[PDB]
N, CA, C and O atoms as a Tinker XYZ file with bonds, in Angstrom:
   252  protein
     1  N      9.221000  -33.434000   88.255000    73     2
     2  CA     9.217000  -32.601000   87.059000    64     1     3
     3  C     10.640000  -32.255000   86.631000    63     2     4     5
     4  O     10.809000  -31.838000   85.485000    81     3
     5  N     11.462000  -32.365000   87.286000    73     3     6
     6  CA    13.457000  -32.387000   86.861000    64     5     7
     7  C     13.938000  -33.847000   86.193000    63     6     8     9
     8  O     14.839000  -34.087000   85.390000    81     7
     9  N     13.069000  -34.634000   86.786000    73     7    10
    10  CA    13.633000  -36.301000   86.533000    64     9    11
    11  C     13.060000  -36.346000   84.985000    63    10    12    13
    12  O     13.882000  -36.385000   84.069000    81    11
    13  N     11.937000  -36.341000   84.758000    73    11    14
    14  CA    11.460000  -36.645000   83.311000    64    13    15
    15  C     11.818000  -35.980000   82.349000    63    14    16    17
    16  O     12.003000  -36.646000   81.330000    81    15
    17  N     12.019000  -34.743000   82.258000    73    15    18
    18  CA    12.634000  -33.004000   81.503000    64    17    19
    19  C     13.793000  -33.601000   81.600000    63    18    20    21
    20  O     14.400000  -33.279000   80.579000    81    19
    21  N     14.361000  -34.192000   82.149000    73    19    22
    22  CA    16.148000  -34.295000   82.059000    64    21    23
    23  C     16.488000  -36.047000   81.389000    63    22    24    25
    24  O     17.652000  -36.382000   81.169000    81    23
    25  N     15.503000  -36.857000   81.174000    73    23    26
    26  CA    15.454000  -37.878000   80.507000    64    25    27
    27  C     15.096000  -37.842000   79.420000    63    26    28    29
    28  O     15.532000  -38.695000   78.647000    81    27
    29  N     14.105000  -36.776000   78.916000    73    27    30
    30  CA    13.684000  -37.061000   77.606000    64    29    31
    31  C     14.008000  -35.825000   77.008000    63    30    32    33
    32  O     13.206000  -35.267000   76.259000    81    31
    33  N     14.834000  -35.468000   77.207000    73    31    34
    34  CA    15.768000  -34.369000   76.901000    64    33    35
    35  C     17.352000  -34.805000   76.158000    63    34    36    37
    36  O     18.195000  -34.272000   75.437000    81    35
    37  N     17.121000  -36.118000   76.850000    73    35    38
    38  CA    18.818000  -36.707000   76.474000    64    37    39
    39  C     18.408000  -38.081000   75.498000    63    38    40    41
    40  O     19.265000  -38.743000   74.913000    81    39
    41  N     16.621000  -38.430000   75.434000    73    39    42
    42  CA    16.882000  -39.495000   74.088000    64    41    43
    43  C     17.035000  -38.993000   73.444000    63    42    44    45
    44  O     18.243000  -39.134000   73.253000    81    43
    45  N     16.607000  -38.204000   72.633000    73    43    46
    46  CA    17.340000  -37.953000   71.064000    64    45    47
    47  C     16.256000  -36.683000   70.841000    63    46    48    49
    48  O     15.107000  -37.119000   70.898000    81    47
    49  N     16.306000  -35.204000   70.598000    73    47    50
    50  CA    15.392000  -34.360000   70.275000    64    49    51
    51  C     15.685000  -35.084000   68.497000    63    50    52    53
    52  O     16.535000  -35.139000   67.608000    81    51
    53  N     13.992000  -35.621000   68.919000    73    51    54
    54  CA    13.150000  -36.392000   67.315000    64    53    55
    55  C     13.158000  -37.459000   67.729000    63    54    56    57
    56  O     13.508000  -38.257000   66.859000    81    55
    57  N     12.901000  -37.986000   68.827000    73    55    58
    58  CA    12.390000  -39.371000   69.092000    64    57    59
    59  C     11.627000  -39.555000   69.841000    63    58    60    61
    60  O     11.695000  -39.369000   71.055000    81    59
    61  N     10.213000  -40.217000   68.806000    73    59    62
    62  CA     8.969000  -40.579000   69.603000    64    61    63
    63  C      9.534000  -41.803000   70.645000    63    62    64    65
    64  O     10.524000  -42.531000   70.709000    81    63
    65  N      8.468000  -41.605000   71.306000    73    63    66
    66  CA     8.641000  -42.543000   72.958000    64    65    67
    67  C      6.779000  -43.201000   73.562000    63    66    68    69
    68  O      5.786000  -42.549000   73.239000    81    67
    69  N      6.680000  -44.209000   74.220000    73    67    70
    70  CA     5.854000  -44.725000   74.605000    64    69    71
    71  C      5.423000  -44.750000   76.549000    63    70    72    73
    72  O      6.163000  -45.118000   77.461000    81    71
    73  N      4.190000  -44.292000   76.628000    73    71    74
    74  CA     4.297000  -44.435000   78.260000    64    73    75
    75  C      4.612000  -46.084000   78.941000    63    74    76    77
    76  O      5.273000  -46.347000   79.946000    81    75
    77  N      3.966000  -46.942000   78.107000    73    75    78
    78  CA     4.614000  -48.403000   78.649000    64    77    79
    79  C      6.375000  -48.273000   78.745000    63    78    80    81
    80  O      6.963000  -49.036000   79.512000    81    79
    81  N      7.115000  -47.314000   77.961000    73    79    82
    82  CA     8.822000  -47.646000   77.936000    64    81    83
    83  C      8.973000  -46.826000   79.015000    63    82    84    85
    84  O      9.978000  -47.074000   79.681000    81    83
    85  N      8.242000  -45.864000   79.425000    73    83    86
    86  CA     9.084000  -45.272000   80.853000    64    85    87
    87  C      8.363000  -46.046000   81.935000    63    86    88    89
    88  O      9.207000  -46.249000   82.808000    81    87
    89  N      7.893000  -46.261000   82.082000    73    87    90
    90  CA     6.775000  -47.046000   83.051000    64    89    91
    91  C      7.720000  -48.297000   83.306000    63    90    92    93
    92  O      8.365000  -48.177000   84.348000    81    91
    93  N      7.866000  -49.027000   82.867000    73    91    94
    94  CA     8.868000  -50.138000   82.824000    64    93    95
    95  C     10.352000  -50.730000   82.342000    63    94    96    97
    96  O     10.903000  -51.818000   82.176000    81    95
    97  N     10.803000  -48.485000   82.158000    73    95    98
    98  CA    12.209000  -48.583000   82.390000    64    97    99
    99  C     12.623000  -47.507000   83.195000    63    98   100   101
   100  O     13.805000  -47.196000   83.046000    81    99
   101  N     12.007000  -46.891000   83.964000    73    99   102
   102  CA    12.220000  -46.326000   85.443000    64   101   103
   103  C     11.672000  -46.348000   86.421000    63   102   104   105
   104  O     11.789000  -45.601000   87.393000    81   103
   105  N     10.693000  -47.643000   86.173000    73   103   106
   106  CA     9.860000  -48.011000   87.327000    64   105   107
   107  C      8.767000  -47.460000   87.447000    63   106   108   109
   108  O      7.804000  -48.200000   87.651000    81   107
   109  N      8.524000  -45.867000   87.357000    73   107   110
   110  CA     7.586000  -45.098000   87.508000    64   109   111
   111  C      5.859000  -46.120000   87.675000    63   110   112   113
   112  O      5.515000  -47.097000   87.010000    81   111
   113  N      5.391000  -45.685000   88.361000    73   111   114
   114  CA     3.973000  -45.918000   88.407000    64   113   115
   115  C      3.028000  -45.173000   87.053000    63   114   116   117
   116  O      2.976000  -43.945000   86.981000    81   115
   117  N      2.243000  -46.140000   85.924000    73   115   118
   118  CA     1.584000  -45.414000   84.858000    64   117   119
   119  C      0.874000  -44.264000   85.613000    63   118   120   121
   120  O      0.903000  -43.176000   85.038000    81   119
   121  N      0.095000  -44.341000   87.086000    73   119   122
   122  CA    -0.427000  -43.397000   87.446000    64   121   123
   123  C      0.318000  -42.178000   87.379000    63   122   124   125
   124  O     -0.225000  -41.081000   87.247000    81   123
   125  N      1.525000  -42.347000   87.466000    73   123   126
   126  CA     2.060000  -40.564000   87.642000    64   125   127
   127  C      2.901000  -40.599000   86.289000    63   126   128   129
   128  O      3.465000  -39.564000   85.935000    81   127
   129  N      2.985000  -41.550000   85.659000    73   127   130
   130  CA     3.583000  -41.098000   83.993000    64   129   131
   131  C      2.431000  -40.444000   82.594000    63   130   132   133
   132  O      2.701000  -39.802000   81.579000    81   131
   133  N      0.860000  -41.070000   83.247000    73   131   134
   134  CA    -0.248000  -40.605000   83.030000    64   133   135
   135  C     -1.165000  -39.206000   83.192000    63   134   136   137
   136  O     -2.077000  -38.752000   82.501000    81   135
   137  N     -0.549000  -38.755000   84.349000    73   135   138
   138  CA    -0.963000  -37.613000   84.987000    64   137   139
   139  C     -0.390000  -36.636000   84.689000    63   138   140   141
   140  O     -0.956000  -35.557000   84.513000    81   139
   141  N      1.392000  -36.913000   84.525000    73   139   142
   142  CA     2.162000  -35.833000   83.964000    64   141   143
   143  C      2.216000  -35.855000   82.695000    63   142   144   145
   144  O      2.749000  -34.848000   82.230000    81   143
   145  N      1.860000  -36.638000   81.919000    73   143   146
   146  CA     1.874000  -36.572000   80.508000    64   145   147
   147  C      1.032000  -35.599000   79.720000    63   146   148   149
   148  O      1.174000  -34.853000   78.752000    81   147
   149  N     -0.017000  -35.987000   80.673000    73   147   150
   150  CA    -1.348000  -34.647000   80.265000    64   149   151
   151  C     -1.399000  -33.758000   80.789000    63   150   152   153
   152  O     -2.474000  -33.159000   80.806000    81   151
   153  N     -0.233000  -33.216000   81.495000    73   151   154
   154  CA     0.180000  -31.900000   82.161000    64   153   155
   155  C      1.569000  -31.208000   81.467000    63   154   156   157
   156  O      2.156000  -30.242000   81.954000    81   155
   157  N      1.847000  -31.704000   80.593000    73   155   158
   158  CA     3.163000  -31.464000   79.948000    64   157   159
   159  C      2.910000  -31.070000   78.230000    63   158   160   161
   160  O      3.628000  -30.282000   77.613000    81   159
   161  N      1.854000  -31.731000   77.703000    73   159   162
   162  CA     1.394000  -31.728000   76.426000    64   161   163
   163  C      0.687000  -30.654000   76.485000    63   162   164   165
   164  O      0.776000  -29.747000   75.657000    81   163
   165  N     -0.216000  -30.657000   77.641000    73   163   166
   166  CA    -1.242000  -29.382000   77.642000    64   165   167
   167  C     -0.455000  -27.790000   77.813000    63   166   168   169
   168  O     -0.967000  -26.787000   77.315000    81   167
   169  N      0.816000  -27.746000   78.568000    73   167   170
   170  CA     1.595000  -26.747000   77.940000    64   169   171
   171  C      2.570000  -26.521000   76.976000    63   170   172   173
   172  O      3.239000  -25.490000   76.924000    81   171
   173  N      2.681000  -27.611000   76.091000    73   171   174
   174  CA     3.271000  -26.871000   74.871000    64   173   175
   175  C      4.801000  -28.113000   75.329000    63   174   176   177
   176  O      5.755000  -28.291000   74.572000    81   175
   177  N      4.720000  -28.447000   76.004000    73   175   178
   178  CA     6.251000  -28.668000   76.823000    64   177   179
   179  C      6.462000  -30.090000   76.141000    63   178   180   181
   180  O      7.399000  -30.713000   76.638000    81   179
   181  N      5.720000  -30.804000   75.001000    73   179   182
   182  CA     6.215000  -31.997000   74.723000    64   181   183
   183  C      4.641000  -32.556000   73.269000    63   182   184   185
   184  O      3.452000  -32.771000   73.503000    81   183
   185  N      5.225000  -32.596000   72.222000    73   183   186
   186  CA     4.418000  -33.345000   71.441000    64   185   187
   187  C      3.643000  -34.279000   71.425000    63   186   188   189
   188  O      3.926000  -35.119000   72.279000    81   187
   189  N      2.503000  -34.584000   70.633000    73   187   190
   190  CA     1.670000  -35.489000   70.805000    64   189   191
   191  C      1.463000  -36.008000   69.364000    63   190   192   193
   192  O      1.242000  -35.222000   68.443000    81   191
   193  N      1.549000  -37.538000   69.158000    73   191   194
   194  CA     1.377000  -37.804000   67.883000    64   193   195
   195  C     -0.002000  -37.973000   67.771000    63   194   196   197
   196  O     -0.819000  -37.730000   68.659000    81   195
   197  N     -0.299000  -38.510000   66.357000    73   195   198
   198  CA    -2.196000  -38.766000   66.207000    64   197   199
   199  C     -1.977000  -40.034000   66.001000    63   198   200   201
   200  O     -1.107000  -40.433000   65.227000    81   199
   201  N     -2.871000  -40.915000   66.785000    73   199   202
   202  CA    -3.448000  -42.132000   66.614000    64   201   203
   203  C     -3.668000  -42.809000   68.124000    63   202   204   205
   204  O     -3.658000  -42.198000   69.193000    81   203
   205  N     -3.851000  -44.105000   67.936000    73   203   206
   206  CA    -4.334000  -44.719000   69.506000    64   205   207
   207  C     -3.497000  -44.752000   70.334000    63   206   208   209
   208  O     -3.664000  -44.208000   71.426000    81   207
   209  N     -2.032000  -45.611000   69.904000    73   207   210
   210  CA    -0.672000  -45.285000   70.993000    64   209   211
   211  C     -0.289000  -43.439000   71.011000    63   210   212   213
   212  O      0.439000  -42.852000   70.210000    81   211
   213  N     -0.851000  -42.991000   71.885000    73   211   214
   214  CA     0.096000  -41.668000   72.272000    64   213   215
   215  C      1.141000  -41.372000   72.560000    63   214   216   217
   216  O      1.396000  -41.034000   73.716000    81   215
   217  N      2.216000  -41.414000   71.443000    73   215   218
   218  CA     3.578000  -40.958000   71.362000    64   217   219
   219  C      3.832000  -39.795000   71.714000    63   218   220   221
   220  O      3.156000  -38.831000   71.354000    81   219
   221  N      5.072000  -39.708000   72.638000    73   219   222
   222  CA     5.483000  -38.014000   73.141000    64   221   223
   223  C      6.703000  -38.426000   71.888000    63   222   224   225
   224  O      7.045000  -39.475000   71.342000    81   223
   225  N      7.240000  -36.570000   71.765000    73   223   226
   226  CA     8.614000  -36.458000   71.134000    64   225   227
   227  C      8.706000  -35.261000   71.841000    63   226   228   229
   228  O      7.672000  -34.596000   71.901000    81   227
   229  N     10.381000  -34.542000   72.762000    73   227   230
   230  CA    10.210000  -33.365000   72.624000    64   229   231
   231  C      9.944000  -32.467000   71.873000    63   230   232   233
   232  O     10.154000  -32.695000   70.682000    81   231
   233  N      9.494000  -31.374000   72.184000    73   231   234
   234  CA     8.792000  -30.524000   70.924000    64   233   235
   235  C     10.224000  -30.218000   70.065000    63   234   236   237
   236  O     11.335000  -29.910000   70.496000    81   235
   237  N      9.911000  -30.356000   69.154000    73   235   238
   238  CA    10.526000  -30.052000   67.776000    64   237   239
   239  C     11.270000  -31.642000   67.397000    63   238   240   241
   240  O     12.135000  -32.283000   67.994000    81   239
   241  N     10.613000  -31.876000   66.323000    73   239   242
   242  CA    10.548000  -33.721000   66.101000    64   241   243
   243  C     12.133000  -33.336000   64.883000    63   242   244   245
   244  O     12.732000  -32.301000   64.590000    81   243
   245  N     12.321000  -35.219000   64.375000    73   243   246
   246  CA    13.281000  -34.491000   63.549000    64   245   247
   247  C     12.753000  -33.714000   62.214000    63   246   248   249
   248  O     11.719000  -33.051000   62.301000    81   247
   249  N     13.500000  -33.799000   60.910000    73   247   250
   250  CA    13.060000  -32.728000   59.583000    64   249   251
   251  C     12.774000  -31.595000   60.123000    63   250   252
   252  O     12.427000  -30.646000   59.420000    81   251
């Protein structure tokens, strides 16, 4: 929970992101990029776009 907060903290506050791009650019297992994803959205701690690919952005996108 320090490793991911401190990565997607430094792409760009306003940039959507994909679980396949961390999954297979830090190795991570989808099982635990899956698990924390829906533990992070569900507090407020990271955006969710609408449609089938579920895009995170940290909260507060750009505009």
């Amino acid at each position: 929970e320090q490793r991911i907060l401190k990565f997607l903290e430094e792409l760009g506050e306003g940039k959507a992101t994909t679980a396949h791009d961390l999954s297979g650019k830090l190795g991570t297992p989808k099982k635990e990029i899956s698990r924390v994803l829906y533990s992070l959205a569900k507090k407020g701690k990271l955006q969710k776009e609408a449609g089938t690919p579920p895009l995170w952005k940290i909260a507060v996108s750009t505009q």
